[PDB]
Structure 1
Amino acid sequence: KETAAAKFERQHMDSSTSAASSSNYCNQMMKSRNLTKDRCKPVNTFVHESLADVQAVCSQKNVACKNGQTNCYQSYSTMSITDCRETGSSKYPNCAYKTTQANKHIIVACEGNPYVPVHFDASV
């Protein structure tokens, strides 16, 4: 029902905030976006750029995906992102996360027609 493109937007897009709102950000967002529903998803990145900017990465720099597929693309510009990483003390269902804001190139996997982001591979 939920397209892979929609799921990418749900898991990785947050254009409302231009940086990691607060120390609470990840705790709130991993829950709100249903990334703590079944397990504590252990790491996850949010992007604070427009959807059009992130989508445009699919026509940017073609690089190898971590799994060895060829459909990953690195942004020529740095982007505002927040990484969310599970604390050691985190215990499902109360998933707890460190919020780290950064500005880095993002790497996304794209697929489909139209050719859109479906996975967040890495940032560099």
Structure 2
Amino acid sequence: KETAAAKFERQHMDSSTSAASSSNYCNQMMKSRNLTKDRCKPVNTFVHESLADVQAVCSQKNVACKNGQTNCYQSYSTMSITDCRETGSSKYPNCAYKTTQANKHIIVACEGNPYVPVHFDASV
């Protein structure tokens, strides 16, 4: 299978750009990361920082995850992110999203060796 770390990178990492520019970033990103493949993935966040800076969150502020595990970490700094959320009228297979650029702290679950993000828990 794809590893959990790899899946996180496919779903949540966009180190290419410092922000979302065109307000159909989400439409194109969601498609190219295979998140509109079988259905429209309703919500998804992209992080626009280096992979090194993102992996480093795994040694920052330890917090509970939503599921109640305690291997989650909150970034000390705000990060450049894009919140993609499907529109009220979107219907597969013509998936429609709005793009919201923001600077927020991320919370990720970390696991494995090397100890890297395996789950995007939230932005705050």
Task: Give the TM-score normalised by the residue count of structure 1.
Answer: 0.98
How far the C-alpha of 1:22 sits from its partner, in A, is 1.3
Alignment: residue pair count: 124
Distance 1:5 1:20 in 2: 23
Query: CA RMSD, aligned part only?
Result: 0.6
* 3-state secondary structure, aligned to 1:69: coil
Q: What are the Cα deviations for residues 36-58 of structure 1, in whole angstroms up to 9, with x where unaligned?
A: 11111010000000000000000
How far the C-alpha of 1:31 sits from its partner, in A, is 0.5
Q: Could you tell which deviates more after superposition, 15-24 or 75-84?
A: 15-24
Q: What are the Cα deviations for residues 26-76 of structure 1, in whole angstroms up to 9, with x where unaligned?
A: 000000000111111010000000000000000110011011110110000
Identity across matched positions, percent:
100
* 3-state secondary structure, aligned to 1:8: helix
* 3-state secondary structure, aligned to 2:27: helix
Q: 1:91 is matched with which residue?
A: 91
Unaligned runs of 5+ in 2: none
Distance 2:24 2:101 in 1: 12
Distance 2:96 2:8 in 1: 22
Distance 2:9 2:48 in 1: 11
How far the C-alpha of 1:21 sits from its partner, in A, is 2.4
How far the C-alpha of 1:2 sits from its partner, in A, is 1.3
Distance 2:21 2:56 in 1: 25
Distance 2:96 2:26 in 1: 8
Task: Give the TM-score normalised by the residue count of structure 2.
Answer: 0.98
Distance 2:28 2:38 in 1: 16
Question: Which stretches of structure 1, 4 residues or more, deviate above 3 A after TM superposition?
Answer: none
